[PDB]
Design a protein around this ligand. Structure first.
Ligand SMILES: CCn1c(-c2cc(N3CCN(C)CC3)cnc2[C@H](C)OC)c2c3cc(ccc31)-c1csc(n1)C[C@H](NC(=O)[C@H]1C[C@@H]1C)C(=O)N1CCC[C@H](N1)C(=O)OCC(C)(C)C2
Ligand SMILES: Nc1nc2c(ncn2[C@@H]2O[C@H](COP(=O)(O)OP(=O)(O)NP(=O)(O)O)[C@@H](O)[C@H]2O)c(=O)[nH]1
Ligand SMILES: [Mg+2]
Lengths: 163, 169
């Protein structure tokens, strides 16, 4: 059975609401497990306290840099980077959860939640989950974004874990 | 009052487009790689005694969006065509950027400067003479730079302003 994790989202420190995700361990076990463990913090590091550093209305919200907190960092539970597990699943619409990277086989911890279909990223980014509950929170987040991604307020993962 | 110049920085992923620009604007360099969506900056400078305002567009090297460059190329007045001296593929990409700019502006006479960046590094794979020959064939200046040491950073942007002035007379 696929794990479920949650993010408690805050905006300049004030709570907004909870987003939960189904992680497709049945198709991408290695990628789902990285995101699961980073959500629990069980390796002694992970998503708690980090920001959504890039939000572009009509496209996606991206976050997960808990090592440098500036959009350039992050690391997996397997080392700094790990390989593209597979590209079975596609960027079919809003709510898809998928790995950010800097080219082939550079998965770390950064990820992005789609707010629209982004099919041109198929075969380049590993899809590994989707929003289960709280898609309205992700939509609420979009108005803090902009054309180039800079956010006008600090959007943070105040708490996270496994359900 | 002072003339505004619309500079556009183009080139392959990771060649130093943003590091050159941030050195110009903020006088510092970081080794981390923050890949660009699109950024814009303003700075006033003095070039050949004349004060002017630089409007700088820092563009994405991401190749998947090559079809989305037309509007910023129409708007721009001059182009820093940046490659990295340790990255032969970025030097080869220069020709495709230059052809796109000429095609989009429908002119053989567009202000441009060839920039070979990361000249602080020892792993050079593009000879200086190889870049100067290309620039000579294009009829544009070639300037070597390092964003890390600041070598040539002012010179590259200022030379492009001089090219734009010559174009407008
Ligand atoms: C041309 C302008 N542009 C655009 C773009 C594209 C369109 N289209 C319209 C027509 N349709 C059919 C095609 C697309 C329209 N409007 C714009 C924007 C709004 O014009 C300003 C994008 C983009 C992405 C990058 C650079 C320039 C870019 C880029 C730069 S690094 C990158 N991608 C990949 C990025 N790595 C990282 O962060 C590394 C550091 C970490 C480890 C990454 O893993 N992720 C996750 C997936 C999404 C991606 N970030 C991102 O942010 O995508 C932004 C998006 C808007 C979705 C695409
Ligand atoms: N040694 C050295 N490293 C440099 C130099 N210029 C940039 N770099 C490094 O090369 C990497 C890429 O630089 P960046 O400015 O982000 O390149 P870009 O062309 O703007 N990339 P993109 O097109 O994705 O936006 C960074 O790690 C940066 O520190 C330079 O002159 N010397
Ligand atoms: Mg850049």
């Amino acid at each position: 059975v696929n794990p479920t994790v949650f993010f408690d989202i805050a905006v300049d420190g004030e709570p907004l609401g909870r987003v939960s995700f189904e992680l497709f361990a049945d198709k991408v076990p290695k990628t789902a497990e990285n995101f699961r463990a980073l959500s629990t913090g069980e390796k002694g590091f992970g998503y708690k306290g980090s920001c959504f550093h890039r939000i572009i209305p009509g496209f996606m919200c991206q976050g997960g840099d808990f090592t440098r907190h500036n959009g350039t960092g992050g690391k997996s539970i397997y080392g700094e980077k790990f390989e593209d597990e597979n590209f079975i699943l596609k960027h079919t619409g809003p709510g898809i959860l998928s790995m950010a990277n800097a080219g082939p086989n550079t998965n770390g911890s950064q990820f992005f939640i789609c707010t629209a279909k982004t099919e041109w990223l198929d075969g380049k980014h590993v899809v590994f989950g989707k929003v289960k509950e709280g898609m309205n929170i992700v939509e609420a987040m979009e108005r803090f974004g902009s054309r180039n991604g800079k956010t006008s307020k600090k959007i943070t993962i105040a708490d996270c874990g496994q359900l | 009052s002072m003339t505004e110049y619309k500079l556009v920085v183009v080139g392959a992923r990771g060649v130093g487009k943003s590091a050159l620009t941030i050195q110009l604007i903020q006088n510092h360099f970081v080794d981390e790689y923050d890949p660009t969506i699109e950024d814009s900056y303003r700075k006033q400078v003095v070039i050949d005694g004349e004060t002017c305002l630089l409007d700088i567009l820092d563009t994405a090297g991401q190749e998947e969006y090559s079809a989305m460059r037309d509007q910023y190329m129409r708007t721009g007045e001059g182009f820093l065509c940046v490659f990295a001296i340790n990255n032969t593929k970025s030097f080869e990409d220069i020709h495709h950027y230059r052809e796109q700019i000429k095609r989009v502006k429908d002119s053989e006479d567009v202000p441009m400067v060839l920039v070979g960046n990361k000249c602080d590094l020892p792993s050079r794979t593009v000879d200086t003479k190889q870049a100067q020959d290309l620039a000579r064939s294009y009829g544009i200046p070639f300037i070597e730079t390092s964003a890390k040491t600041r070598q040539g950073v002012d010179d590259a942007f200022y030379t492009l302003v001089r090219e734009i002035r010559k174009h407008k007379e």
